[PDB]
């Protein structure tokens, strides 16, 4: 059981999640 | 009850005002400050209160302090907290009373 | 216990990229702030309620002019989340006694001293 988070706190977590950068070309399809 | 510092450092104090209450000697009388039988501290002059550290030397007659003091190492000596009041007025001035 | 908090000093030390983005030279700093309230003081601690009344920001969306001096800035930091700050700008110079009755403030932050309500042509 996880104690529920105040909706304001829940909004904070959603906006600060990790975002990875993505390459333009996938390595496998490259020579 | 309510043991504590009645007058804090940097306050104008009149004669007779009580500065601190204590069950034991957390502070010691200094300049122009007296002792009450209950060990309260009051001001003997009109002026500003000050708290300062200073060296402690006991009366020769009392045994307990002398025994401890001599037993201290050569390097340093013990200290204590002292309370002082700085007088702020001239006790009097000369004025012309009569021309004879 | 929820209590008053102190912001770390680093927050208010800018970076070179910030100067480019917002277009302010770290020299020749501006003199007058334009401040507007864009949120509400209900459900906020009482210290924030009092400061908003000290700065004159009772009505929302009405601009107030203040000095860019340290004592004022100390108060603005307390209510930074409820207000918007824009630097004042005077393209045509400070208003004189002659032009005092023809000034008008634009949304950009420019206090023009002549207002004719005519096409620029």
């Amino acid at each position: 059981h996880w104690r529920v988070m105040h909706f304001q706190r829940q909004k904070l977590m959603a906006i600060t999640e990790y975002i990875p950068p993505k390459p333009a070309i996938n390595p496998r399809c490259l020579p | 009850k309510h043991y504590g510092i009645k007058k804090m450092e940097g306050h104008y104090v009149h004669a007779g005002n009580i500065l601190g209450t204590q069950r034991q000697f957390r502070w010691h009388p200094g300049a122009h400050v007296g002792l009450g039988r209950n060990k309260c501290l009051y001001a003997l002059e009109e002026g500003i209160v000050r708290y300062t550290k200073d060296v402690y030397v006991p009366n020769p007659k009392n045994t307990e302090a002398v025994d401890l003091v001599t037993s201290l190492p050569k390097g340093a000596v013990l200290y204590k907290t002292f309370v002082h009041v700085v007088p702020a007025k001239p006790e009097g001035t000369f004025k012309l009373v009569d021309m004879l | 216990k929820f209590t008053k908090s102190r912001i770390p000093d680093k927050v208010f030390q800018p970076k070179p990229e910030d100067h480019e983005k917002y277009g302010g030279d770290p020299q020749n700093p501006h003199k007058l702030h334009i401040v507007t309230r864009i949120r509400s003081t209900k459900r906020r601690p009482y210290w924030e309620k009092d400061t908003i009344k000290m700065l004159g920001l009772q009505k929302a969306h009405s601009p107030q002019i203040h000095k860019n001096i340290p004592s004022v800035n100390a108060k603005l930091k307390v209510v930074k989340h409820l207000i918007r700050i824009q630097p004042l700008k005077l393209p045509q110079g400070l208003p004189t006694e002659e032009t005092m009755s023809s000034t008008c403030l634009k949304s950009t932050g420019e206090l023009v001293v002549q207002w004719h309500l005519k096409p620029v042509e």
């Binding site: 959603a14 | - | 917002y22 302010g24 700093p29 702030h33 001096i69 930074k80 700050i85």
Partner: protein, 78 residues
Amino acid sequence: RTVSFQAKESMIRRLEVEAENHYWLSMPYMTAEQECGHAAERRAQAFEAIKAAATSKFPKHRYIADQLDHLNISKKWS
């Protein structure tokens, strides 16, 4: 719960505004010492106005005209 798209964007827009607020508060025109005393004269005058209003209370004048005008209630065409 799942945070809706609207809620995430609206919060971001408010974050961006506050970021600019931090920047414009970092460049004080005058240092603390230069500020000291620069507005003393204006402040002192203001309190003098406040004190003057406080100590100005007193009753109001009374006039014979007000009392004697009550008689016009019985004016007529003779």
